[PDB]
């Protein structure tokens, strides 16, 4: 029943950025080819009087070869004609991590507890995603509420990503 098209992606009505704000913990991930930020990321997202969003992350990343770094990134956040979608901008601090423009888009969230959010890099000549990711915060470092994490994985299911995830862990590294 349920389509799998991008442009068919429901998105948070009505965004609103300086509720969001805030500290955000990572607990689950979907990863996207060429994976970066593993685990224990941690999300300060913030937004100055403009109405600019903007955040700053911070994860273990495992690079080459066994080589895993405390990364801190840095995202800037630009509009779009839609409130839930923004184009991000992001880099991090030493020039030789990463760096990109992903449309990142808010699926829903209630700003006090849980966040879900999606990336899709590459379609598909059907519309569907070729290549996405996706992150499920929670506001909380011990998990979100059983009720929260049921609209959570209705969610997850929405995005045709569900049992596609994986549990992020705090263990303490960064």
């Not at 070869?65 to 409130?83: K, L, Q, R, Y």
């Not at 030493?94 to 209630?110: E, M, R, Y």
């Not at 519309?127 to 929260?148: H, I, K, M, Q, W």
Request: charged share 30%; glycine share 6%; proline share 3%.
């Amino acid at each position: 029943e349920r389509d799998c098209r991008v442009s068919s992606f429901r998105v948070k009505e009505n965004f609103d950025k300086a509720r969001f704000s805030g500290t955000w913990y990572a607990m689950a991930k979907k990863d996207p080819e060429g994976l970066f930020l593993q685990d224990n990321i941690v999300a300060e997202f913030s937004v100055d009087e403009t109405g600019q969003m903007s955040a700053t992350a911070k994860g273990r990343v495992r690079l080459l070869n066994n080589w895993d770094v405390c990364a801190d990134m840095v995202g800037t956040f630009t509009d779009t004609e839609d409130p839930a979608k923004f184009k991000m901008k992001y880099w991090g601090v030493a020039s030789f991590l990463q760096k990109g423009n992903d449309d990142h888009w808010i699926v829903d969230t209630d700003y006090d507890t849980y966040a879900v959010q999606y990336s899709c890099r590459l379609l598909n000549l059907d519309g569907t995603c070729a290549d996405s990711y996706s992150f499920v915060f929670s506001r909380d470092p011990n998990g979100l509420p059983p009720e929260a994490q049921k609209i959570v994985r209705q969610r997850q299911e929405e995005l045709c990503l569900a049992r596609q995830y994986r549990l992020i862990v705090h263990n303490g590294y960064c």
